[PDB]
Design a protein around this ligand. Structure first.
Ligand SMILES: NS(=O)(=O)c1c(F)c(F)cc(F)c1F
Ligand SMILES: NS(=O)(=O)c1c(F)c(F)cc(F)c1F
Ligand SMILES: OC[C@H]1O[C@@H](O)[C@H](O)[C@@H](O)[C@@H]1O
Ligand SMILES: OC[C@H]1O[C@H](O)[C@H](O)[C@@H](O)[C@@H]1O
Ligand SMILES: [Zn+2]
Length: 257
């Protein structure tokens, strides 16, 4: 199956997922000078106060923190979005070293990691139907730089020892994703895709301009996870990012003047 290594990584994915060479693939480089303020954007609303986290899972590519999406408990609205998008999971992408790890880049600069909060459009009833639609998903992306610790990340870091290998999961109730946000909600937005196979072109990307700071110790614990399953030779879970893809016939819009 697909992965991030030399023999099954991003440069190979197109052989099983030909949309990898499609017209609205993600991530992209965000050219901050070409991005244009868009007055048609409405205020962005991140409404996570009633979020219900359930479980954390090592899926062999990253770890997902999963939420109850059976009701509008945690939703994203506004900005470029038409209607209500419900939070289903978050995960990260990160590097082997602090100088790489993000999927999106900003004027070609790579951050140490990138957080993705994944939401599906409730008009389509389930995530599976949403990923058959051009406006099925909204992903809120947040860059991570290394500096001071992020207190709201520490509960995630401390459970990782219990999900070291592919297929392991643990209870992860009562986690508040609001503690992962930066102060500002200034953002860039563009139409794109999943950054992982099957690379479906369903996503409205909303990428926050302000990075969060995490400590070196926090990201070092991400890098102790394993891509492999229990009892197999250790392959550290690092560099689980897709590089920037061609912008093609797209424009990146900014929420800020
Ligand atoms: N296209 S892919 O990245 O999904 C892939 C490969 F490139 C491969 F060489 C072997 C696989 F099993 C596989 F699934
Ligand atoms: N990176 S991503 O935010 O595009 C993403 C998704 F949106 C998704 F629904 C499932 C994934 F596995 C995934 F990595
Ligand atoms: O034709 C002019 C229009 O060109 C488009 O490509 C831009 O997105 C608009 O902001 C602009 O008003
Ligand atoms: O909030 C996520 C998790 O944080 C800590 O691990 C708590 O010990 C655990 O009870 C909780 O599920
Ligand atoms: Zn992602």
């Amino acid at each position: 199956h697909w992965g991030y290594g030399k023999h099954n990584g991003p440069e190979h994915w197109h052989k099983d997922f030909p949309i990898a060479k499609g017209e609205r693939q993600s991530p992209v480089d965000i050219d901050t000078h070409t991005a244009k303020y868009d007055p048609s954007l409405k205020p962005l609303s991140v409404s996570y106060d009633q979020a219900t986290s359930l479980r954390i899972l090592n899926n062999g590519h990253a770890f997902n923190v999963e939420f109850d999406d059976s009701q509008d408990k945690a939703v994203l609205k506004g900005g470029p979005l038409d209607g209500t998008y419900r939070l289903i999971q978050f995960h990260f992408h990160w590097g082997s070293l602090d100088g790489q790890g993000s999927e999106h880049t900003v004027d070609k600069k790579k951050y140490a990691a990138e957080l993705h909060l994944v939401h599906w459009n409730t008009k389509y009833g389930d995530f599976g139907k949403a990923v058959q639609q051009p406006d099925g998903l909204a992903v809120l992306g947040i860059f991570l730089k290394v500096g001071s610790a992020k207190p709201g990340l520490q509960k995630v870091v401390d459970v990782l020892d219990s999900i070291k290998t592919k297929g392991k999961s643990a209870d992860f109730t009562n986690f508040d994703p609001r503690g992962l946000l930066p102060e500002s909600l200034d953002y860039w937005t563009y139409p794109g895709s999943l950054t992982t196979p099957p690379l479906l072109e369903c996503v409205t990307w909303i990428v926050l301009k302000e990075p969060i700071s995490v400590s070196s110790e926090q990201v070092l614990k991400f890098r102790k996870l394993n891509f492999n399953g229990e009892g197999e030779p250790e392959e550290l879970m690092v560099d689980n990012w897709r590089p920037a893809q061609p912008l093609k016939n797209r424009q990146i819009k900014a929420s800020f003047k």
